[PDB]
């Protein structure tokens, strides 16, 4: 704006016109300097409007560039997090029995609903009340999915460990119900 020479031309037109008015210059010279003041004001105003629109455009584009940089920086973070989750879930895979059943399959395609059922090392039974607990995992060992499981832990709703000797019919109401019982494959 003020850095442009059009502002300087406006300033010198103003100076010349003010000097002519102070000196009481003739009407023809005063009209010529009024024309100079007008054309300087118009040119400088055009320059100022163009400069303002230029600054608006530049700070719109830098805003867009900040937004795109943030987007491309979030994409890389999500890709890294997704690869981390996939490789950790790979690390948890029980690569002996799972590989055995896959190499035992027809084309190597086993339905997903039997991938845990034959390879999962941990079995979380969830039991809503004592009447079911008597008929599903009574004792320290029970049979489910044609394999023998042994109780390792029994927790209640608020995750406070309950020993297996406290699950009795008379002691049933005092327990915090459904009991997540975690067992291991044997």
């Amino acid at each position: 704006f003020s850095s442009l020479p059009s502002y300087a031309a406006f300033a010198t037109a103003q100076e010349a016109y003010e000097q002519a008015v102070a000196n009481g210059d003739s009407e023809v010279v005063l009209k010529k300097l009024k024309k100079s003041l007008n054309v300087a004001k118009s040119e400088f105003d055009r320059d100022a409007a163009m400069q303002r629109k230029l600054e608006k455009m530049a700070d719109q584009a830098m805003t867009q560039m900040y937004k795109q940089a943030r987007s491309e920086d979030k994409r890389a973070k999500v890709t890294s997090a997704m690869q981390t989750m996939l490789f950790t879930m790979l690390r948890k895979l029980d690569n002996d029995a799972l590989n055995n059943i896959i190499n035992n399959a027809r084309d190597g395609c086993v339905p997903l609903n039997i991938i845990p059922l034959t390879t999962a090392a941990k079995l979380m039974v969830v039991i809503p009340d004592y009447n079911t607990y008597k008929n599903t995992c009574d004792g320290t060992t029970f049979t489910y999915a044609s394999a023998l499981w042994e109780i390792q832990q029994v927790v209640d709703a608020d995750s406070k460990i309950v020993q297996l000797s406290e699950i009795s019919m008379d002691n049933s109401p005092n327990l915090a119900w459904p009991l997540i019982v975690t067992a291991l494959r044997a």
Partner: protein, 590 residues
């Protein structure tokens, strides 16, 4: 994608895209770099190209930002801002880019093609970030030069293992050795699938190639092999961690009275316990590697990673450890490929063990105690950055000798490298002196060490041995073959095979000739165990048969000859070609 400038470490989002390695640059640094060199392509979060589809103008000196895109002057929108302006180039964090006056070194590093010795000495006297960037772009240039090799189309299949090949004319044929791999292609007008990874060896007789493939597909005439290139990944860790002296030994627990032979090294063990990192320089065969073994013994409560640049060097380190260190804490990690023969006596590929041995490139990302880098002269700043990025540790020892032969640096061809610019650690050794220093040869007899004290080593050795009269010289020339630019001397091999009987104690001698093709040839005619000079330098043998093939710049370098001869534990017969080199040492005449 934002980051830090590789010249002033300011926040920025520009990348000078004309560079092969594509480094970040601050705004002021990017302007000073694109104003001077021919680098005229800047990548912001989206590339600076004329977004008008009917244009191809990429130079950042004339591109104008309009709306939300960029245009040349011809497609300039009514409202537009010039990018290259008032000493800067428009980009993110424009107001906080502190400029730097070090743009000349960065221009010279990113512009030069790594051919003359000036580029390398510029790559070792610059700042830390410039050190890393120069090493990374040097590795990238090596990879791209590897990419420019020819394509090997077969002509016929000689046997199930023997193949007859022909390389495409117009591009130089890569030499045949175990390092270079190829991917095969089967063109049947469709289905150009990778048929396997093949490693090639020159045959015993005739223009024949013995191939070893990952796959077992039968080769046909139409299959052609193309060399594979490895994408060099960027590095972050500094070349040297900042030294921080400690008042007392930390992270270590010394053991009283470890042994009697390690008596003179106790003070140096305490010094290594003191400093954060330390350097040990000594003449060859002076216990530098065995010092690291005694260092492991002196601090038995330290999970030590021995790592080395070479392969047989780390294997010899494993052998020395098995000689001294208790076996059942040592492991030797080999890579997944492992196309070269490793040392199979420790529990292979056991990262969790206490005494872990590895090559630099195969190091696993781990925490550790004191880590010993072996043969620093063989390694470049890429290797030091890798070992300092993958192994986070509480003590670093760097052992090696500047007088030995350095890394190959295949790009370098004109001029010779001074020792002190081999890498950062060798510069440390030749600037302020080694932190520990021990020179007296416990390896070689008196005559060989006397000759090597008349050689490049200005006479300083005081070796504790006597003349065993087991050092022999020859002079005859021999014939050159120039197989793949790796010469083979058949009559010299024939004379060695002739000798071979008159002194039966040399039937267990080990063959030494750099010349990998001649090294492979020696495995057939006489069948002695053999080793090239570069994969040597860290092992030793009782009897050594050294054969100088050609009077070239390669096998007449004084460092290479010295490191070839000084592996002789009890004796060496060297058959020489150069009159001056043969006359410069004092063995028997023959």
């Amino acid at each position: 994608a934002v980051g830090a400038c590789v010249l002033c470490n300011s926040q920025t989002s520009l990348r000078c895209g004309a560079c092969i390695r594509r480094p970040f640059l601050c705004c002021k640094c990017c302007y000073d770099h694109v104003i001077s060199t021919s680098h005229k392509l800047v990548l912001s979060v989206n590339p600076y190209v004329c977004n008008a589809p009917g244009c191809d103008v990429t130079d950042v000196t004339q591109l104008y930002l309009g709306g939300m895109s960029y245009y040349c002057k011809s497609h300039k929108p009514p409202i537009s801002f010039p990018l290259c302006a008032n000493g800067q180039v428009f980009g993110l964090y424009k107001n906080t880019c502190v400029g730097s006056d070090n743009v000349t070194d960065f221009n010279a590093i990113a512009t030069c093609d790594w051919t003359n010795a000036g580029d390398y000495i510029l790559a070792n006297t610059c700042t830390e970030r410039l050190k890393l960037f120069a090493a990374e772009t040097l590795k990238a240039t090596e990879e791209t030069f590897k990419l420019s090799y020819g394509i090997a189309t077969v002509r016929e299949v000689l046997s199930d293992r023997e193949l007859h090949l022909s390389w495409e004319v117009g591009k130089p044929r890569p030499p045949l050795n175990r390092n270079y791999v190829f991917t095969g292609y089967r063109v049947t007008k469709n289905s150009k699938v990778q048929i396997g990874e093949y490693t090639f060896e020159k045959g015993d007789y005739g223009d024949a190639v013995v191939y070893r493939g990952t796959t077992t597909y039968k080769l046909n005439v139409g299959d052609y092999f193309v060399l594979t290139s490895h994408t060099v990944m960027p590095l972050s860790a500094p070349t040297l961690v900042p030294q921080e002296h400690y008042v007392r030994i930390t992270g270590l627990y010394p053991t009283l009275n470890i042994s009697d032979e390690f008596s003179s090294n106790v003070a140096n063990y305490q010094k290594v316990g003191m400093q954060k990192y330390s350097t040990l320089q000594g003449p060859p065969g002076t216990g530098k590697s065995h010092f690291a073994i005694g260092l492991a013994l002196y601090y038995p409560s330290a999970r030590i990673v021995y790592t080395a640049c070479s392969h047989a060097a780390v294997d010899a380190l494993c052998e020395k450890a098995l000689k001294y260190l208790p076996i059942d804490k040592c492991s030797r990690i080999i890579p997944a490929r492992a196309r070269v023969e490793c040392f199979d006596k420790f529990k292979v590929n056991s990262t969790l063990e206490q005494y872990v041995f590895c090559t630099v490139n195969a190091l696993p990302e781990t925490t550790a105690d004191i880590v010993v880098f072996d043969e620093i002269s063989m390694a470049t700043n890429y290797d030091l950055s890798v070992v300092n990025a993958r192994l986070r540790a509480k003590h670093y020892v760097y052992i090696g000798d500047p007088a030995q032969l350095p890394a190959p640096r295949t790009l370098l061809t004109k001029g010779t490298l001074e020792p002190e610019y081999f890498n950062s650690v060798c510069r440390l050794m030749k600037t302020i002196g080694p932190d520990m220093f021990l020179g007296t040869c416990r390896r070689c007899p008196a005559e060989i060490v006397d000759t090597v004290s008349a050689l490049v080593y200005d006479n300083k050795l005081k070796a504790h041995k006597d003349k065993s009269a087991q050092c022999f010289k020859m002079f005859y020339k021999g014939v050159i073959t120039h197989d793949v630019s790796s010469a083979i001397n058949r009559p010299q091999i024939g004379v060695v095979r002739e000798f071979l009987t008159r002194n039966p104690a040399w039937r267990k001698a080990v063959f030494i000739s750099p010349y990998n093709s001649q090294n492979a040839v020696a495995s057939k005619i006489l069948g002695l165990p053999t080793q090239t000079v570069d994969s040597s330098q860290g092992s030793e043998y009782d009897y050594v048969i050294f054969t100088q093939t050609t009077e070239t710049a390669h096998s007449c370098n004084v460092n290479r000859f010295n490191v070839a001869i000084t592996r002789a534990k009890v004796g060496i017969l060297c058959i020489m070609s150069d009159r001056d080199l043969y006359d410069k040492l004092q063995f028997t005449s023959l």
